[PDB]
Design a protein around this ligand. Structure first.
Ligand code: HEM
Ligand code: CA
Ligand code: CA
Length: 315
């Protein structure tokens, strides 16, 4: 199909997305930057989708965190998400797509702005949400590995898919974990979708970058980085440590598994066969240029190797 402005897409129903793409790159992502609004929109796709429990309900990736914001922004795990919800709600009101489709489209367009990134498959047509998420369905950084794996498994993700989804923390920072140092990132390259998060979380902790007693925070290996306790434990727990190390220096695996597992997350609560594939509307992301590395001045002796089968690689 050729859209009324001359851009092309495989299925004509997808043409309605091109004005929405242009508005979000200019007016939500500040000129198609890989910056805080993209990171917040990617976080939003998970706090919308993960509201999905076979036993308790919620519609998954349904736009409920926007449509029922008054409820879901009261849940403590959703602290700080009201800012991105408030920024996105007018685009949903102005354009003619459901909040569920908007949150997943904005997350995929955002990830495409980041070097190393991927085009997450995108499907159009989710109906409006009909119920708020149940409470207590979002993992917290102070939850155990067994708690996080059981929650994610209840929503349909195996332990290795949890590690693949956490490649998101390669383009991520925290404002609430230690409110004294907002914007401190989880890896040293928060505008590049790369393996540094999987490397840096395997280093021995050394210090706290701000204050020392924050719930859910582990010591970080670097003054300019913050570490969640959940990431500290997942990189070391025998259930997930070999998969975590397998992503280091493995950008093809990070890209293939993040795109596929994000698509599965974006479709929680939905049926692909009832929607229209509009994948090819997402922009083509830049590629990486620099090699994966330990931080300068660190060595293998600073790595806490946690996979018995396979030594951590020389970088
Ligand atoms: C599985 C357990 C997870 C835990 C415990 C967890 C925890 C957290 C925390 C505590 C923050 C910082 C919030 C703040 O203080 O500002 C955060 C940020 C973020 N998370 Fe995760 N998360 C998890 C999984 C995920 C998943 C699956 C995604 C995929 C989309 C995701 C995407 C992001 C992003 C992109 C940010 C950065 C937000 C920003 O820079 O504005 N998280 N996460
Ligand atoms: Ca939801
Ligand atoms: Ca990174």
């Amino acid at each position: 199909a050729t859209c009324d402005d001359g851009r092309t897409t495989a299925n004509a129903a997808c043409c309605i997305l091109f004005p929405i793409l242009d508005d979000i790159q200019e007016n939500l992502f500040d000129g198609a930057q890989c910056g805080e609004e993209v990171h917040e929109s990617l976080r939003l796709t998970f706090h919308d989708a993960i509201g999905f429990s076979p036993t308790l309900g919620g519609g998954g990736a349904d736009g409920s965190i926007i449509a029922f914001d008054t409820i879901e922004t009261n849940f403590p795990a959703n602290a700080g998400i009201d800012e991105i919800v408030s920024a996105q709600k007018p685009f949903v009101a102005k354009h003619n797509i459901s909040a569920g489709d908007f949150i997943q489209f904005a997350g995929a367009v955002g990830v495409s702005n980041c070097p190393g990134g991927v085009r997450i498959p995108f499907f159009l047509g989710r109906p409006d949400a009909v119920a708020a998420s149940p409470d207590h369905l979002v993992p917290e950084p102070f939850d155990s590995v067994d708690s996080i794996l059981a929650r994610m498994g209840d929503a349909g993700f195996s332990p290795v898919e949890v590690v693949w989804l956490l490649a998101s923390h390669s383009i991520a920072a925290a404002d609430g974990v230690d409110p004294s140092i907002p914007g401190t990132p989880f890896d040293s390259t928060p505008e590049v979708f790369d393996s540094q998060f999987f490397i840096e979380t395997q280093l021995k902790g050394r210090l706290f970058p701000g204050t020392a007693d924050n719930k859910g925070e582990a010591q970080s290996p670097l003054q300019g980085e913050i570490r969640l306790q959940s990431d500290h434990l997942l990189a070391r727990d025998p259930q997930t440590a070999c998969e975590w190390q397998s992503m280091v220096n493995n950008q093809p695996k990070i890209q293939n598994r993040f795109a596929a597992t994000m698509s599965k997350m974006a479709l929680l609560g939905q049926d692909k066969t009832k929607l229209i594939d509009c994948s090819d509307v997402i922009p083509t992301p830049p590629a990486l240029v620099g090699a994966a590395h330990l931080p300068a001045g660190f060595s293998l002796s600073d790595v806490e190797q946690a996979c018995a089968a396979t030594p951590f690689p020389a970088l």
